[PDB]
């Protein structure tokens, strides 16, 4: 299985435009991740990972993005905050695992890494597994803003500015979210 294509990738996606890769037509052995980074968190929800070698799943989705360390707790079923509500939402029925590790050596830059952004304003919360890459102005006031930012109308995206001088809470963390799906279609990912 193309686990390396997701984990050892050069650049990860911003959390607001998060990446999804469908895993199929392969055997899912995780020895790779076991021989991967010293992990910050390996949080599985609704599934024993000690049973992830006898899996027999049809489709497995590898969601990947970058956030700060403070926000890794938000990547969980039934959480709240800017990331969980505006950028990446997991369902309360989530059947998968969240793998995260400090990426400060790859994603932090000298004057801040302003290529990683996240969504700060949204009128309603995302539905689970929804993706909003819109860049349109936000209306915090009652002035109708005809595509123009300003006094009470905001641009909805904000860069992280990852710097090596930040503490681990604000340092970049790469997150891979494996969603284990069970449909009637025969097994395409096994162990």
């Amino acid at each position, epitope marked *: 299985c193309p686990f390396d294509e997701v984990f050892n990738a050069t650049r990860f996606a911003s959390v607001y435009a998060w990446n999804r890769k469908r895993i199929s037509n392969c055997v899912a052995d995780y020895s790779v991740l076991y021989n991967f980074a010293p992990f910050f968190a390996f949080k599985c929800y609704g599934v024993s990972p000690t049973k992830l070698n006898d899996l027999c799943f049809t489709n497995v989705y590898a969601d990947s993005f970058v956030i700060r360390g403070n926000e890794v707790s938000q990547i969980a079923p039934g959480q709240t905050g800017n990331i969980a509500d505006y950028n990446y939402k997991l369902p309360d029925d989530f059947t998968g695992c969240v793998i995260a590790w400090n990426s400060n050596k790859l994603d932090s830059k*000298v004057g801040g890494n302003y290529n990683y952004r996240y969504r700060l304003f949204r009128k309603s919360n995302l539905k689970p597994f929804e993706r909003d890459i819109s860049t349109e102005i936000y209306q915090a006031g009652n002035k109708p803003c005809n595509g123009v930012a300003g006094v009470n109308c905001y641009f909805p995206l904000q860069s992280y500015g990852f710097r*090596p001088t930040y503490g681990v809470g604000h340092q970049p963390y790469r997150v891979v979210v494996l969603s284990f799906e069970l449909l009637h279609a025969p097994a395409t990912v096994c162990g």
Partner: single-chain antibody
Amino acid sequence: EVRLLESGGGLVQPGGSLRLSCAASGFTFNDYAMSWVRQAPGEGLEWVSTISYSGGSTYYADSVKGRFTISRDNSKNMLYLQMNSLRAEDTALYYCANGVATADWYFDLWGRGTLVTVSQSALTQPRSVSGSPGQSVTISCTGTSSDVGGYNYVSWFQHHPGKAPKLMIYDVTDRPSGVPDRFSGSKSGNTASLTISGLQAEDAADYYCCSYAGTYTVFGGGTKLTVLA
């Protein structure tokens, strides 16, 4: 493959002006910070200036602040240094460097250097250490709480005046590609330490510690390592 090439050095009168250029090749130039490091004849390595990957962040050394201007053209894969009010103490071989293989704040890739002729507060190292072939030597580097004791972004460089320095240790303890396990590093508080074991004749060189502190990069005074045949 990956290459940096300096150019634009020459003879200029004191108080004159010169512009240096650095040509990148083999990597995504606009993803990485670029830095200028110089070596003045008889002097140790000195960090001159660092530009961020975008260009909206410039950092300078107090010894040059106000007189040089660093810039980059990401469309042309070029880094530039505008040196004005050139003094005699600016006579040096100038190098451009980035951290393409380690991290954005290190110097692992270097150019060959360009020669500029115009007509301390460094980290404290021993000036000289000697050792016999096959033995081991330890070289110490003592800085303040704002550099070596602030972060763990310490580096160790091998250097021969007249050629670019080579990164030997980064992140206190790690070796880049091609560096033998005979070189190893450690840190305790404000002091870092490089140990060279199994000394060979070619290990004789100058050794500099280095520290990145956010707003600046600072080199040690350098330790000449003589390997007595």
